Amino acid sequence: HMITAQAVLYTQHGEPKDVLFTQSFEIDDDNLAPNEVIVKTLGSPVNPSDINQIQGVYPSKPAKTTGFGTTEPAAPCGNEGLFEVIKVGSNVSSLEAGDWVIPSHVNFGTWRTHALGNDDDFIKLPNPAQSKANGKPNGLTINQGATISVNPLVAYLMLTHYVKLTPGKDWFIQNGGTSAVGKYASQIGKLLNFNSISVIRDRPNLDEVVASLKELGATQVITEDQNNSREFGPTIKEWIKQSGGEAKLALNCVGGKSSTGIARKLNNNGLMLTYGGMSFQPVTIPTSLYIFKNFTSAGFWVTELLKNNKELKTSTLNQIIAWYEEGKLTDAKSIETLYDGTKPLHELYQDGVANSKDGKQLITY
Amino acid sequence: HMITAQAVLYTQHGEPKDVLFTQSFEIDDDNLAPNEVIVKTLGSPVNPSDINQIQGVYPSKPAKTTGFGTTEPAAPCGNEGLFEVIKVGSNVSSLEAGDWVIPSHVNFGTWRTHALGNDDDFIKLPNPAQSKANGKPNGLTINQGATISVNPLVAYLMLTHYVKLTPGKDWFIQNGGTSAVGKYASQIGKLLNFNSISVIRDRPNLDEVVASLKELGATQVITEDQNNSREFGPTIKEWIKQSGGEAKLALNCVGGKSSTGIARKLNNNGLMLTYGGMSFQPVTIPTSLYIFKNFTSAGFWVTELLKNNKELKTSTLNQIIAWYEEGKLTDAKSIETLYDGTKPLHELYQDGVANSKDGKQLITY
Numbered sequence: 001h002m003i004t005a006q007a008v009l010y011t012q013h014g015e016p017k018d019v020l021f022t023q024s025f026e027i028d029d030d031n032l033a034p035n036e037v038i039v040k041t042l043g044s045p046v047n048p049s050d051i052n053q054i055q056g057v058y059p060s061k062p063a064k065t066t067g068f069g070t071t072e073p074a075a076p077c078g079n080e081g082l083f084e085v086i087k088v089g090s091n092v093s094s095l096e097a098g099d100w101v102i103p104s105h106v107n108f109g110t111w112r113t114h115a116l117g118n119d120d121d122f123i124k125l126p127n128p129a130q131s132k133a134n135g136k137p138n139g140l141t142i143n144q145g146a147t148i149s150v151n152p153l154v155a156y157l158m159l160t161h162y163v164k165l166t167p168g169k170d171w172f173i174q175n176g177g178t179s180a181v182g183k184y185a186s187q188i189g190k191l192l193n194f195n196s197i198s199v200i201r202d203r204p205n206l207d208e209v210v211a212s213l214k215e216l217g218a219t220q221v222i223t224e225d226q227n228n229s230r231e232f233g234p235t236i237k238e239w240i241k242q243s244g245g246e247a248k249l250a251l252n253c254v255g256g257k258s259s260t261g262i263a264r265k266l267n268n269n270g271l272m273l274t275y276g277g278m279s280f281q282p283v284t285i286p287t288s289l290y291i292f293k294n295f296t297s298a299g300f301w302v303t304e305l306l307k308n309n310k311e312l313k314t315s316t317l318n319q320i321i322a323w324y325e326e327g328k329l330t331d332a333k334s335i336e337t338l339y340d341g342t343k344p345l346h347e348l349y350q351d352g353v354a355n356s357k358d359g360k361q362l363i364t365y
Numbered sequence: 366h367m368i369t370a371q372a373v374l375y376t377q378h379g380e381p382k383d384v385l386f387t388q389s390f391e392i393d394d395d396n397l398a399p400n401e402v403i404v405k406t407l408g409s410p411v412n413p414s415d416i417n418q419i420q421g422v423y424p425s426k427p428a429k430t431t432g433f434g435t436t437e438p439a440a441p442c443g444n445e446g447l448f449e450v451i452k453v454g455s456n457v458s459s460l461e462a463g464d465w466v467i468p469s470h471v472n473f474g475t476w477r478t479h480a481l482g483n484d485d486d487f488i489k490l491p492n493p494a495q496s497k498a499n500g501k502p503n504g505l506t507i508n509q510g511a512t513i514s515v516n517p518l519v520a521y522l523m524l525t526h527y528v529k530l531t532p533g534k535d536w537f538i539q540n541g542g543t544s545a546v547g548k549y550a551s552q553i554g555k556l557l558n559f560n561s562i563s564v565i566r567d568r569p570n571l572d573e574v575v576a577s578l579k580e581l582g583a584t585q586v587i588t589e590d591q592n593n594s595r596e597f598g599p600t601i602k603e604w605i606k607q608s609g610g611e612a613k614l615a616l617n618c619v620g621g622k623s624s625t626g627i628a629r630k631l632n633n634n635g636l637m638l639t640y641g642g643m644s645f646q647p648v649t650i651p652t653s654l655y656i657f658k659n660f661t662s663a664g665f666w667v668t669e670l671l672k673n674n675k676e677l678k679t680s681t682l683n684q685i686i687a688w689y690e691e692g693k694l695t696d697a698k699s700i701e702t703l704y705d706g707t708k709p710l711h712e713l714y715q716d717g718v719a720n721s722k723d724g725k726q727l728i729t730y
């Protein structure tokens with residue numbers, strides 16, 4: 001009655017290609033404490049924050065332990081993932097075998113095959129058999145379940161928790177329009193009847209990307225060259241005037257000249273939220289917007305916001321779940337790599353890191 | 366019976382050297398409505414906002430009218446000044462002949478010899494005879510009264526209206542430490558028992574400037590080179606550590622690398638207020654301060670803040686007046702040019718614009 005599991009670990013910080021390895025360890029399913037549960041991993045993605053943890057340049061990080069049976073202290077990898085309950089202890093009533101779960105806290109370590117925890121280390125999601133038996137037209141896919149805990153909540157909370165946009169009338173503007181968060185924000189804008197402008201990098205297949213973002217819910221899509229153009233400012237003013245509303249909110253994950261351009265398109269009393277910085281350039285705002293247009297620039301970090309606010313986390317997650325079940329929200333598809341034991345587990349994640357430019361990478365089990 | 370007055374006007378926006386002229390006009394002191402008052406100018410300064418109004422790049426400006434008897438609509442110049450009451454109408458009880466007043470609102474037009482207005486177009490200040498009769502050790506000078514409505518209120522409100530610093534413990538930091546507003550903030554910080562760091566440009570007589578700013582009330586003084594040096598950066602953290610407080614507020618009037626440097630020195634949850642800028646330097650903030658340190662950057666514009674808030678303006682002005690009377694506040698000295706009628710009035714102000722880099726220019730009467 002011993003389960004053999006695999007985990008991706010490191011003994012020292014550095015680049016994933018250099019420091020990651022796979023460790024085998026054992027879990028005893030015949031001797032669970034009353035509140036313990038055992039889970040098997042169904043899938044977990046490679047997110048940028050996971051990589052920064054390994055590099056040692058992220059301010060929140062799991063402790064190095066000898067608990068996986070290593071020769072030296074070693075840390076696990078990954079914060080997001082979808083798990084299935086295999087067995088529960090005698091006092092567990094909130095979970096049963098077959099339930100789908102995600103970690104309730106950060107630093108769980110999701111790049112591995114199995115885990116042992118307490119029942120309150122997890123949040124329950126409905127699995128497809130449960131959604132179907134209760135008459136829902138859809139159930140969660142593995143990719144949808146494995147990525148539900150961050151990017152959908154980021155987009156929802158940025159759009160609803162800070163400024164009240166008037167339906168049909170008001171606008172938000174965002175850069176990184178082809179990012180995962182950007183695509184969730186376009187869909188949520190459409191569902192809540194918010195107008196939006198998406199700014200994106202130009203590309204060889206621009207017409208196809210534009211059509212795809214408008215189908216998700218972007219009202220208009222413009223290139224970074226158009227974002228930089230001062231002669232374009234009157235066209236955008238006329239979009240906003242025709243709707244009878246105002247551009248009240250800007251979402252920035254790029255920085256530099258892109259952040260300047262979307263800040264200039266807000267009406268007076270506008271707010272910018274910076275939630276990423278993929279350009280690695282600082283946020284750059286002209287003095288005149290602060291002084292004469294009452295502009296405010298602030299930050300967003302979902303981990304900090306939800307730290308001591310679990311009603312808000314619960315209520316936001318329930319809404320994302322309901323929209324997936326009703327067929328109203330869709331995920332950006334990941335490139336999936338299945339672990340079948342012929343290739344060491346850490347090499348699949350090393351490939352996921354290296355190929356992240358191709359798109360979101362999900363390792364499945 | 367009839368007073369002949371002079372006013373500096375323009376019919377079109379542009380550079381003061383090109384568009385200003387002087388217009389003669391008449392005021393009838395025998396025909397006052399019950400609430401009208403006649404005032405005579407004592408002095409009015411040349412501020413940067415006054416020049417930008419004339420240039421057409423400042424969004425708050427007086428309307429062009431034919432009220433001075435011009436062939437075309439014309440606008441007056443200047444927003445602050447000190448006046449003496451000459452005569453009041455039959456229903457005026459708040460003012461009497463000999464009182465000192467400032468305009469109650471912006472866009473009044475202070476580059477002129479005389480004005481006719483309503484009693485509520487003016488705010489009374491005590492004149493030196495009244496301060497002396499009230500037992501105060503000092504009375505206001507003309508320079509103090511003529512410049513009291515902008516720079517002292519800017520410094521006071523930025524320090525008290527936005528974040529609450531704990532007296533004796535907490536810190537603010539500012540750049541442009543030798544500017545007029547910067548020198549007022551050091552003195553007000555000292556009166557409120559706030560600690561402060563002033564960042565200044567390096568200069569030949571640095572030790573003398575540092576001693577002088579510390580005597581005004583700055584706790585520590587550093588150069589821009591030291592602000593940018595991370596080797597120097599551990600010293601600043603220990604200053605704050607030793608005081609048992611936190612750096613909570615940054616005041617920015619420079620932009621660019623300087624704004625980055627003072628932002629990096631705030632503790633978590635800090636606020637930056639931008640109230641001025643340098644030609645081409647946008648405000649530049651690292652992405653990581655927004656996301657991981659809960660940093661917020663906002664603007665300050667005294668004209669907009671006090672637009673519809675006369676209670677706040679009144680209580681702030683009363684405190685600045687009391688501090689001058691009690692000897693607790695000192696002004697920077699202006700270069701004063703007297704109008705005696707041999708040279709047209711608009712030319713005195715044109716010279717004041719051209720020489721503003723020598724120091725604050727005050728035209729007196």
Ligand SMILES: NC(=O)c1ccc[n+]([C@@H]2O[C@H](COP(=O)([O-])OP(=O)(O)OC[C@H]3O[C@@H](n4cnc5c(N)ncnc54)[C@H](OP(=O)(O)O)[C@@H]3O)[C@@H](O)[C@H]2O)c1
Pocket residue numbers: 047048049150151154176177178179180181182200201253254274275276277278279300301302303359360656
């Ligand atoms: N603060 C928070 O709470 C929080 C939480 C989770 C994630 N995030 C942040 O949100 C961002 C997106 O995460 P994600 O999962 O959505 O990633 P993602 O889907 O893989 O997309 C990354 C985005 O960055 C853009 N990008 C990459 N390099 C760029 C450059 N040099 N200049 C401009 N744009 C560039 C990409 O655009 P192209 O398609 O044009 O290449 C893409 O839109 C990340 O910065 C992440 O750190 C923040």
Ligand code: NA
Pocket residue numbers: 286287288289642
């Ligand atoms: Na500017």
Ligand code: NA
Pocket residue numbers: 543544545546
């Ligand atoms: Na100055």
Ligand code: NA
Pocket residue numbers: 277651652653654
């Ligand atoms: Na940064």
